[PDB]
RNA sequence: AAGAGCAUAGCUGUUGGGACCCGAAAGAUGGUGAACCAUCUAGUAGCUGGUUC
RNA sequence: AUUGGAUAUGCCAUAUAAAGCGCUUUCGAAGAGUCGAGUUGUUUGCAGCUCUAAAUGGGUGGUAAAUUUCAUCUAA
RNA sequence: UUGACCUCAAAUCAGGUAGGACUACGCGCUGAACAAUAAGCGCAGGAAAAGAAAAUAACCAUGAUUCCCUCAGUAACGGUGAAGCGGGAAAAGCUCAAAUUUGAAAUCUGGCAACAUUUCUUUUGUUGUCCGAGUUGUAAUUUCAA
């Protein structure tokens, strides 16, 4: 704020009092228990054959095929590439 | 009038009458919750209202 | 359809039969409730002031009264407003401050004062709250000298090439981790 | 609690565990009737989450609908018509075959005396939650019928505003 | 239901229920638990009164008798128990009727390493424990006269049951 | 380039509402009987007729 | 004639009590055939159909860039 | 040979409840030749519906819903046609699921005997006791503002 009205540092010139955080944006956090009870149902659950199919696809190399068929399966990038490299870290685990 | 007045106290301090004695007011009023229910409240309430009950202020003018 | 107002007038009197009988209702108390001092969100109306939902959680932290002490004697709590300028945190503050000091808190159980409600109970009077906290614009300035090092800032020197920095912000900030 | 476990478990309905149990499941609920009672919801935490508590007055029915208005809705309305002296709380879902819809609807008992005495659920019993699925106030319905809080979401306008001074 | 079933075979999680305790195991498992009965209804009524005059007389000794020692039941109880590993014994109804409710429970109590078993019938656990139905059961705690003897099922259900199961 | 507009009322003209009045087959919805009925309807009217000192 | 509830008063109550706020040496669970994607219909919303999620995740936007930061909210 | 638990029956068993009418106004579904209309079907109340942000915004930031004025015949779409902001009417906040009390299911319906109270001999409860419901979870505590 150099008391302007525009640039990348624009606003009123004043002294920001540091907010503190809100219970809301824990959102998304990770509990002890509830890492335990996922690690406990993914353990006896098992897997869908989707991601079974794209694993030993990641086991035999064929990376970029898994990658567009997991696109495929969940719609989104982000969700094809947080699934990807779940599946690799309990790749690796085994 | 004799009658049914013989039934009255013959039926008082018992928990169920006659259909053509209980009361007949309407039926929606029948059917609505009785005040007790109404005024029924978890205690979780009952400790804000006995801890925390609307007050009587005012302002100086 | 056709929407008429010939109640217009009725609903005008049924409105001030409403307040009247309100008001009767809880005489002791003030018939509108207090509200902060808060700022239009929009560059047409930011600098205007005028009156919100209610005290952020903040404030009342500050001004040493209870979420729940502040529901019971009439102030409003907004917890979805949160107050970043400090300032905001004052106006605010001693807004609650004043009411404070203009309050009177009748004791419960026949009129043994508990903590530090009151003592006196004659001096129950409903007043409009507005007239003791009223809520003003914001404070001009009147008056003031010199600024001659403001003469020679040129203002297009900020504010021409200013806003073409910024417009260019992007392009040149790519620039830089380009050749980098 | 147990619970946590279980909708982690419900979550992956693509598990073999899910998978064989809602066709043995839902093998046994085609040979039932299209609607009937049940004891004891087979999803007690969906239940416990939706408003269902073990006592009294509360009471789940199950029900199938053909696939192919929505199957959820059309679940309501027909427990609603079928049990006309309840209140019909919410409902959820179970399982699918290739044909069927299963659903548990969770209903409440407006004039049993444990349900009237206890406060979280009086509002159930003043007349105007009775039917709400006839009238779309359910969870599905007021998601159906598009309610909600946003940008995202007539007569104001056909109508004609002619005041006194104009 | 049998062409169903063995078409897509019984999963593990699921087939580990259809097999449970021998009888005779599950006979002294159920002599040492009626020891550990818990108060009766009655019983419970009678050491209210006994409190009553305990705590007239500045609450005697710890309310007027010592620790409690019984079984533990109620599935969230029990598996908020196993989960601070305070549980030394788990017993689980073979037939619940939505399986769900303890298909992990066996996975759950091997991660913990704690001797479990799975005892016929819920019935005869509710009876254990004066309810309709009792889902499954818990021991954590007994008196020292009893502790040979827990050791001892213990590891003949480590012998005849939780051993010779495991993972199949 | 030393601002002239804003508000209200009236008259006249025009656009839209049934739209100066009267009058065409028809069409839809829901019914009754073995075609009829009621609403939409005061419709499409580019016309016929009438239109007051 | 009832009732409005306040005022005073009288009598029981039980009150071995619980709650609010200084602090934390931390822990914080948070709603699934749901969200979403494609597809068909209909007035972005909803609905049928096949697939089907995740934990700083998810929704939503100012920005960027087509990705990004940033802001704001916490659905089923 | 008996007793449990579960599933399902049966009762001219005890207690309750639903239909139908009105429908100006509420909320749905359907829907025509105009119109998200008329007609049709379903379901409520004295109001209904909505409602305590998965909302705005881009500010010095706003703060549940509803309504009025304004935005504005503007944005947007291709004649249809909003919303944020501002002013005003009115203001009120909250409850569960997700963890335990395991040194005590502390919870609840009903049968029976008493004590009451009444808009009221017609109502509404309380106490005691018994029985059942309920550990596949009734209470207490907590709901993200924490």
Same mark, same amino acid.
């Given at each position: ?43 006896? $659950? ?19 095929? $898994? ?28 | ?61 | ?24 209702? !809880? ?5 509108? /409730? !207090? ?50 300028? =400090? ?8 807004? !609650? ?37 009223? !809520?003003?614009? =914001?404070?001009? =300035? ?6 001659? =090092? /403001? ?22 900030? /790519? ?6 | 609690?147990?619970?946590?476990? +279980? @909708? ?19 093998? @046994? ?16 935490? #969906? ?29 309501? @309305? ?7 002296? +309840? ?16 659903? @548990? ?7 049993? #005396? ?15 939650? #009775? ?10 319905? #007021? ?24 | 239901?049998? &062409? ?76 908020? %128990? ?22 992990? %429970?066996?996975? %759950? ?19 254990? &424990? ?22 001892? &099922? ?15």
């Amino acid at each position: 704020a150099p008391g302007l009205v525009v640039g990348l540092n624009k606003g009123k010139t004043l002294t920001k009092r540091q907010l503190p955080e809100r219970p809301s944006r824990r959102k998304g956090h990770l509990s002890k228990r509830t890492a335990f009870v996922r690690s406990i149902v993914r353990e006896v $659950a098992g897997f869908a054959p989707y991601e079974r199919r794209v694993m030993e696809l990641i086991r035999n190399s064929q990376d970029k095929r $898994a990658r567009k068929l997991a696109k495929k399966r969940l719609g989104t990038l982000k969700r094809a590439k947080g699934k990807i490299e779940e599946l690799t870290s309990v790749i690796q685990s085994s | 009038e004799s009658n049914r007045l013989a039934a009255r106290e013959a039926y008082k301090n018992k928990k169920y009458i006659p259909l053509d004695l209980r009361q007949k007011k309407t039926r929606a009023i029948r059917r609505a919750l009785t005040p007790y229910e109404q005024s029924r409240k978890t205690l979780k309430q009952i400790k804000k209202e006995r801890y925390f009950p609307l007050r009587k202020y005012a302002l100086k003018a | 359809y056709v929407k008429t107002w010939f109640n217009q007038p009725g609903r005008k009197l049924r409105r001030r039969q409403a307040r009247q009988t309100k008001a009767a209702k !809880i005489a002791p108390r003030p018939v509108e /409730a !207090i509200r902060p001092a808060v700022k239009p969100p929009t560059i047409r109306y930011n600098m205007k002031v005028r009156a919100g939902r209610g005290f952020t959680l903040e404030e009342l932290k500050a001004a040493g009264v209870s979420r729940r002490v502040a529901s019971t004697i009439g102030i409003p709590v907004d917890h979805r407003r949160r107050n970043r300028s =400090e300032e905001s945190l004052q106006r605010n503050v001693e807004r !609650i401050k004043v009411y404070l000091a203009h309050l009177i808190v009748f004791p419960r159980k026949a009129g043994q004062p508990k903590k530090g409600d009151a003592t006196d109970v004659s001096g129950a009077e409903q007043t409009d709250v507005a007239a003791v906290l009223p !809520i003003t614009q =914001e404070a001009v =300035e009147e008056a003031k000298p010199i600024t001659e =090092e /403001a003469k020679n800032f040129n203002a297009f020197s900020t504010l021409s090439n200013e806003r073409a920095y910024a417009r260019y912000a992007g392009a040149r900030a /790519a620039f830089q981790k380009k050749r980098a | 609690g147990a619970y946590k476990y +279980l @909708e982690e478990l419900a979550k992956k309905k693509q598990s073999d565990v899910n998978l064989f149990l809602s066709r043995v499941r839902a093998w @046994e609920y085609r040979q039932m009737n299209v609607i009937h009672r049940a004891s004891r919801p087979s999803r007690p935490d #969906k239940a416990r989450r939706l408003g269902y508590k073990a006592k009294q007055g509360y009471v789940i029915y199950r029900i199938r609908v053909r696939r192919g208005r929505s199957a959820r809705c059309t679940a309501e @309305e027909r427990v609603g018509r079928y049990c006309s002296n +309840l209140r019909v709380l919410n409902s959820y879902w179970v399982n699918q075959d290739a044909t069927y819809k299963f659903f @548990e609807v969770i209903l409440v008992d407006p004039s049993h #005396k444990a349900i009237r005495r206890d406060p979280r659920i009086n509002w159930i019993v003043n007349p105007v939650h #009775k039917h709400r699925e006839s009238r779309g106030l359910t969870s599905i319905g #007021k998601k159906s019928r598009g309610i909600g809080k946003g940008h995202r979401f007539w007569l104001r306008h056909n109508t004609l505003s002619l005041r006194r001074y104009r | 239901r049998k &062409i169903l079933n063995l078409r897509l075979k019984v999963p593990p999680a699921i087939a580990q229920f259809q097999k449970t305790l021998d009888k005779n195991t599950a006979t002294q498992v159920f002599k040492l638990l009626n020891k550990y009965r818990p108060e009766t209804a009655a019983e419970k009524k009678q050491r209210l009164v006994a409190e009553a005059e305990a705590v007239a007389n500045g609450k005697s000794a710890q309310d007027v008798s010592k620790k409690p020692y019984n079984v533990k039941y109620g599935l969230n109880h029990v598996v908020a %128990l196993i989960e601070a590993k305070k549980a030394k014994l788990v017993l689980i109804a073979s037939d619940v009727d939505p399986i769900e409710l303890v298909v992990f %429970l066996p996975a %759950l109590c091997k991660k913990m390493g704690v001797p479990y078993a799975i005892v016929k019938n819920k019935a005869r656990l509710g009876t254990v &424990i004066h309810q309709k139905t009792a889902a499954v059961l818990a021991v954590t705690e007994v008196r020292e006269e009893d502790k040979n003897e827990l050791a001892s &099922i213990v590891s003949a259900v480590d012998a005849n049951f939780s051993a010779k199961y495991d993972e199949s």
